Structures are given as structure tokens and as C-alpha cells.
Amino acid sequence: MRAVNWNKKEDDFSLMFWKQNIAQFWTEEEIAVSSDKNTWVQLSKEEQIAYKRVLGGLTLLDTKQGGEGMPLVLVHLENLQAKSVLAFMGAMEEVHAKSYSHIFTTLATEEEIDDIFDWVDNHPLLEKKAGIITSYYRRLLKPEVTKKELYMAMVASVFLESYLFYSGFFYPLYLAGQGKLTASGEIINLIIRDESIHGVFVGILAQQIFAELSAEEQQEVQKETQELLMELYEIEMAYTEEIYTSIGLVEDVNRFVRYNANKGLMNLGLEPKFEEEEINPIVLNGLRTD
Amino acid sequence: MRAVNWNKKEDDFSLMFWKQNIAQFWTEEEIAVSSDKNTWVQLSKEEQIAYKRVLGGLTLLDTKQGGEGMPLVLVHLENLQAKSVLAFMGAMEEVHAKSYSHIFTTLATEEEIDDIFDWVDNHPLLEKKAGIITSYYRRLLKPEVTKKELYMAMVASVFLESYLFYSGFFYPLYLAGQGKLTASGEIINLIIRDESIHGVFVGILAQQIFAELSAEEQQEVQKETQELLMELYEIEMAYTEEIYTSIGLVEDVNRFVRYNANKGLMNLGLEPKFEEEEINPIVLNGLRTD
Amino acid sequence: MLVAYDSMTGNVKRFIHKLNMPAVQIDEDLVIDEDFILITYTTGFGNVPERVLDFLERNNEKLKGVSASGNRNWGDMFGASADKISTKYEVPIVSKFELSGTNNDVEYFKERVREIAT
Amino acid sequence: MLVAYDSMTGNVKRFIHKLNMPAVQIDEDLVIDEDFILITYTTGFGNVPERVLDFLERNNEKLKGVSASGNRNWGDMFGASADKISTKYEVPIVSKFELSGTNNDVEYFKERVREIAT
Ligand SMILES: Cc1cc2nc3c(=O)[nH]c(=O)nc-3n(C[C@H](O)[C@H](O)[C@H](O)COP(=O)(O)O)c2cc1C
Ligand SMILES: Cc1cc2nc3c(=O)[nH]c(=O)nc-3n(C[C@H](O)[C@H](O)[C@H](O)COP(=O)(O)O)c2cc1C
Ligand SMILES: [Cl-]
Ligand SMILES: [Cl-]
Ligand SMILES: [Cl-]
Ligand SMILES: [Cl-]
Ligand SMILES: [Cl-]
Ligand SMILES: [Cl-]
Ligand SMILES: [Cl-]
Ligand SMILES: [Cl-]
Ligand SMILES: [Cl-]
Ligand SMILES: [Cl-]
Ligand SMILES: [Fe+2]
Ligand SMILES: [Fe+2]
Secondary structure, rough: OOOOOOOOOOOOHHHHHHHHHHOOOOOOHHHOOOHHHHHHHOHHHHHHHHHHHHHHHHHHHHHHHHHHHHHHHHOOOHHHHHHHHHHHHHHHHHHHHHHHHHHHHOOOHHHHHHHHHHHHOOOHHHHHHHHHHHHHHHHHOOOOOOOHHHHHHHHHHHHHHHHHHHHHHHHHHHHOOOOOHHHHHHHHHHHHHHHHHHHHHHHHHHHHHHHOOOOOOOOOOHHHHHHHHHHHHHHHHHHHHHOOOOHHHHHHHHHHHHHHHHHHHHOOOOOOOOOOOOHHHHHHHHHHHO | OOOOOOOOOOOOHHHHHHHHHHOOOOOOOOOOOOOOHHHHHOOOOHHHHHHHHHHHHHHHHHHHHHHHHHHHHHHHOHHHHHHHHHHHHHHHHHHHHHHHHHHHHHHHHHHHHHHHHHHHHHHHHHHHHHHHHHHHHHOOOOOOHHHHHHHHHHHHHHHHHHHHHHHHHHHHHHHHHOOOOHHHHHHHHHHHHHHHHHHHHHHHHHHHHHHHHHHHHHHHHHHHHHHHHHHHHHHHHHHHHHHHHOOOOOOHHHHHHHHHEEEEEHOOOOOOOOOOOOOOOOHHHHOOOO | EEEEEOOOHHHHHHHHHOOOOOOOOOEEEEEEEOOOOEEEEEOOEEEEEEHHHHHHHHHHHHHHHEEEEEOOHHHHHOOOHHHHHHHOOOEEEEEEEOOOHHHHHHHHHHHHHHHHOO | OEEEEEOOOOHHHHHHHHOOEEEOOOOOOOOOOOOOOEEEOOOOOOOOOHHHHHHHHHHHEEEEEEEEEEHHHHHHHHOOHHHHHHHHOOOOEEEEEOOOOHHHHHHHHHHHHHHOOO
């Protein structure tokens, strides 16, 4: 039985990702969010509700990626140096999840916070969305998995990492780019930098497996990947209308969703499928300001 | 579907373990081992071979615990705050594994190092030992698992964490406690402090599940736990004779194995089963000196 | 002598049951009105549990000695809770032992507590 | 103009195929003897790939401009490889674009390189 040997490289990228994960390591204790209260109270009730709701959803996705996605994908790899990077990334998914609780405990009372979590757990579109993704992961709960099964879990992963989060990340960035909740914003920026490299990494691993599939399996997973992309886009449009209609931001969020979908596709070595538009400039400012 | 909410505690200990994991975070880059060469060359060939062989074995166990053990145990927990801690601990198992490569690349040439890894992969007692442990983990590769199955994977875990490593940890400590390879020794000390709290944590989770078993399941897992303990002790005595006969340290290592077995049992809330003896004082000195 | 203790995972509690001297698990409101020995466990980096620190603020006048449960895996931080308490309140370290303690640890403790009751 | 580039995961390579200007992927021994534009990707914290830094040590005299592929998710470190290279070798930043670039990025690049060939 093999032990991980770093003095014999198994691929040409795991070490750099190993190192960058660790270089990126941060924890919520490093960012005080108390100072956000000054801008928090100036928001409307509708803005406040949208923010908390989106943080709920972000926390759900990180929960599942740390608790299901990285574990079930990594358990089946033969590349032990890649397995290592994925374990670390899964831990970071929990670091992120906890960082949302840290934000919540300035912006809300304990009762409000628990109400949000109950809302998340009972919310049918969130259940649906997270359930489609996690069904690719739970398919790996067996001793032996096919390359196609593993490939599709990796596609699902990259879709979550690089695409599904962004309907939520939109709002903290949008406000931070207006100078509102900038502390909470800095935390989300750290999160996104982590997730960005998670998506790249899992897309690399996916492309390796794709190259090994037969021409016929390749055609099958290409079709399945387009289907999943568009099924998720359809759910995300329903989710953005729920969350953002109240504050008039639905089409802006949908545009941002498409922009990130295209990035997720490219992480898989695939062509963009949505119209190319520039990033929302206010969101961009939220990414920059620190 | 539930997201992790840290503002509603799911148990009375996960937060403290979450925090202590993070407080303990270290990486190999923090400890330069170059200065060990001065004492390394003064060792005999037989001492050198034993050290490298034991590092091989340590690397194997950390590989499997990070790549199989923590992932398959955590995927099945309902306690999301505990899941979080276990993901982090699994990442740390990979940090440790890599720290052994860092040691190796001062003490050996690339060819020597790859030879050790080949030796580890083909070694029948190591295969056997790691295979008994991992068979408890691979039983969890299915959608639904019983409390008994989960309990026994957690017993296996604690046995690996708190017991199986110590036939290997003996040697770097023993030499460091003589002032030889003290840099490599400091790395092993960091590793052991991590593993020590890993064992405590998983033993807590096991005791929770035990308390939920029926009287009859309790009797069954108690028997299975004693069997596994003693099956592993039998293999460890075969392993210690292989590795340490050449340097005359077999009974010292066996004593240390028993001492740690008893600690592992207590981590499970169980009675010691080996005679109580004080720790090897030279090993103790290896633990202290920094 | 009366033993006050704190136990998180059951080890200190198991030790105290090997003594059959009278002993009580500390809490927030607890006040101890007689001479006593404290047995604490040790938290990360050789530290004192918060519950013990809070207790001792209110009960240190009658504290006559402290023992710590820890794990020798922590090296120089082995049972250093006893060092911190001993220093802060100027009482002796009775003993340090690992986990639920051995029999020699039980006998040692008993002898030291007699000695200290002098 | 000749384009030298480096691509780790295929994005810069995809971009260069949208240009049909002549272009070559850099390596260790490569020497470029004519005026050229460099397209690099960006490594963590806005840094320059090592392979690019090594190349440029030997070929910076003919470097006329640098573009970077990155990802706007990196905020102020977006394509900052171009900033580092521009500063070190005193050449212009041609453009910054994300991943395999958009069509506007392709046209932009083409216009800038003409402008700079002046
Ligand atoms: C998170 C954590 C940190 C610890 N830190 C230390 C330490 O610095 N020194 C020490 O001797 N023991 C330390 N230990 C070991 C405990 O003090 C030891 O297991 C003790 O027996 C626990 O007693 P209890 O079962 O009554 O809680 C630590 C244990 C845990 C779980
Ligand atoms: C580990 C890592 C770190 C990165 N750091 C940065 C960064 O600091 N700034 C940036 O704009 N892009 C950064 N990126 C994004 C890449 O530069 C971007 O995906 C680029 O298109 C890669 O080009 P290639 O596919 O040709 O390698 C990083 C990507 C990875 C994988
Ligand atoms: Cl989960
Ligand atoms: Cl990135
Ligand atoms: Cl709207
Ligand atoms: Cl495509
Ligand atoms: Cl479109
Ligand atoms: Cl493994
Ligand atoms: Cl411990
Ligand atoms: Cl011997
Ligand atoms: Cl027992
Ligand atoms: Cl015995
Ligand atoms: Fe991620
Ligand atoms: Fe461990």
C-alpha cells in the first residue's frame, strides 16, 4: 500500500497548489467585523434580509463542499499528492463556512441567526440546487467508481466552486464596492481567492480524466456537463428572483452568474456558453478595495 | 439541507478542538532540518536504515488517515461542527505526511528515498496492518452506515492516531532525547501534539455513539475492540522485531507500544489492558528538548 | 482532605474515583469553605481550563495544593496547568500524572497530600 | 509582431490561438532574437511565473510590451505579473485580460500592439 512521496512528483502542478493553499491560509479571527455595524444600520430592512439570506446560502455550499464534495472526490484518487491538496481545500471550505458565522454574530441576534439557518434548511430551491450537486458526490459512496462518475463529480465540484457561489458572493461585493460592510467584504474576498484556486485545481484534475475517456464517454460527459450547466442556471435564475427582486438587482446578479459560469467552464478546458460581458464595475470595486 | 451554524452549539467540545487545531497549525517550511546532517553521519548504517524505514511507515499511516480515515468517518456524521474539525484534522494528516518528505530530502538521496517508498508499498506487514485499519473505513463506502460500523471506524481511527504510530515515533524521539537529529525530532514533536488531540477528539465522538448503542451492540463492539487491539499488538510486535532487532531496541519499543495502547484505550473511555509502566526516559527527553 | 476537580473527557474523574477521598467536580457557582486540593486537566499549550481559573478567583484562599492530569506527549507543557496555578496562588504542585493516572500516581498523590496536610 | 507566451492550464494558449499572429510557448533554453510581446499568466499574489522570470533574464533586451492573463477575483493583484515585468524591464503593459480572454480583449490587444510597433 502506497504512502505519499513528495520527492517523486506524480504530476506537474500539485505542489504549487499545495503551497498556495497554505500561503493563503487565514481564519475569521484575523478580520474584525464590528466596524461594519455603522453601515449595516443604514441599510434597509430589505437589503438586510437579502444579505443574511445570501450568507445562509453561501454557508450551505461550503458545508457541502467540505463535508461531501472534497471527501468523496479525494477518497477515489490514485494521485496521492493531488489527494493531499484536496484534503486541504476541504478543510478550507470549513474555514469559510465558519467565517460566515463570525459575520452573522455582528449583523444579527442569536434568534435572527437561527431563523436564517432554519430558512436555509427548509428552502426548496436551495435543497434542490445543493441536492443536484451532492448527488454526483454521493454516487461515489461505493468501493469502485468509473472514470465517468469521477469526472462528473469533478464537473459538479467546479460548478459549485466557480459558478454556484456567485449568486451569493454578488451582494457582499456589491455593497463593499459602495463602501458598505467592507470588513465582511474583505472576508468574502479571502474566501473568493481560495475558491478561485479550488476551481482551477479540480478543473485540472477533471481534464486529466477526460483525456483518458473513450470518444464515446467523452461525448456522453460533454452532454451531461451542458445539461448540468443549464439546469443549474435555470435554478439560479429562480433563486436570484427570490432573493433580489425586493432590492431591484435581479438582472445584475443574473449577468454576474453568467460571467462566472463561463469562468467555470474554462476551468474545465471548455468553451464559454453565455454571452461575454464585462464584470459589474461596482462588484469589481468590492473586489479591489481592502 | 443543513448548513453549519456555529452560533448554535451542537456539542460541548467541537469549538475548542476547532480552535486548537488551528492554533497548532504549522508546516514543514517552519523547521529547517539541514543541521541534522552533523549527527546523521555519526549514526551507523543500521541506525540510518531503521530511521528511514520508520519514517516510511509513519508516512503511510498519515497518508491513509488523511486520504481515507478522516474523509469516510466525517462524511457520515450529522454533527456539522464535528465534521468541520475532522476535515481540518485530515488536512493536518497530509501536512504531517509531507513533513516526512522534507526530513527525507536531507537524510537521503532521491534514489534512497524512492527505494524506501517502494519498500513501504511492498512490505507485507505494513500492508496487513494498514489494511486492517482501512477495512473499517472502506466499510463506510455506502450511503447508509450503522452506528456500530461508524463506532468501529472511530475505534480504528483512535488506534491508528494514539497507538499504531508509536512504534515509529519511538525512534526519532529516542535519538532526539540523545541529542541526535533534534531538528527532525522537533518536527515529530509537532506531529505528535496534533495526533494526540486527534485521538482525544475521535475518542469523544466514539463514546457518544457508544452511549447510543443497545446493550447487545455494546457488548459486540466491546469484544470487537479488544480483538482489534490485540490483533494490532501482535502485528506491531512482528514489526518491531523486523525494524529494531538490528539496533537492539525491540523490547524498549514494545514497552512504548503498550504504553501508548493504554492511552488509546483511555481516549475511548476504556480501561488499560497492558501493564502500567513509566515512559522510556530517553524518549521523554526527546519530547521535551526543543 | 477534600478534593475539588475539573474533568472534561472523564480522565480526572476516573482518577478521583481511585482515591476514595471525598471529591467534588467544580462549577461556576461552587464555593469551597474548607482546605482543599485541586486536580485540573491541562488545555492547549499547557494552559488552565477557564472554568478552573474562574473557580479559583473565588476559592483560592483555601487552596492547599494542585495536581494536573495531562499527557507527556506535550513535552515541557506536560501538566503545566499546575505550574500556572502554583505560581499564581503560591501553593505547591502536589503531582502531575497522565490521563486517568497509574497506581503509582494514585499512591504518590495520597502520600503528597498527607505530607502537605502538615 | 512575434508573441512569446507561457501558459500553465491552457488559457493563455487559447488566447494566442485567437490572434493568428505568430506566437511561441517559452521554455528554459529559448532565445528570441527579434522584437516581441510577452503574454504571461499570473501566479499567487500577483506574481510572475518562474519560467517567465528565467526567460526574461536572457531575453529582455527585445521585449517590447507585456500582457497578463489572470482573474479579476484577485482584486488589486489582477494580472499584476504585467506590473512586475513592466516595472523591471521598463516596457509598457499592453493589456490585462481574464482567463482565455474575450473578443474585446483580443481586439484590444491587436490595437495596442500596432500602436506599440510605432
Ligand atoms: C485540546 C487539548 C489540549 C491539550 N493540551 C495539553 C497540554 O498542553 N499539556 C498536557 O499535559 N496535556 C494537554 N492535554 C491533555 C489532557 O490534559 C489530558 O488528556 C487530560 O487527562 C484530560 O483530562 P480530562 O479527561 O479529565 O478532561 C490536552 C488535551 C486536549 C484535548
Ligand atoms: C495558484 C494560482 C494563483 C493565482 N494567482 C493569481 C493572481 O494573483 N492574480 C491574477 O490575476 N490571477 C491569478 N491566478 C489566475 C491565473 O493567472 C489565470 O487562471 C490565468 O488565466 C492562467 O493562465 P493559463 O491557463 O495559461 O496558466 C492564479 C491562478 C492559480 C491557479
Ligand atoms: Cl455536509
Ligand atoms: Cl484563480
Ligand atoms: Cl429586479
Ligand atoms: Cl466545450
Ligand atoms: Cl447568454
Ligand atoms: Cl490514501
Ligand atoms: Cl493530548
Ligand atoms: Cl533487540
Ligand atoms: Cl474496557
Ligand atoms: Cl502486558
Ligand atoms: Fe472551494
Ligand atoms: Fe492524526
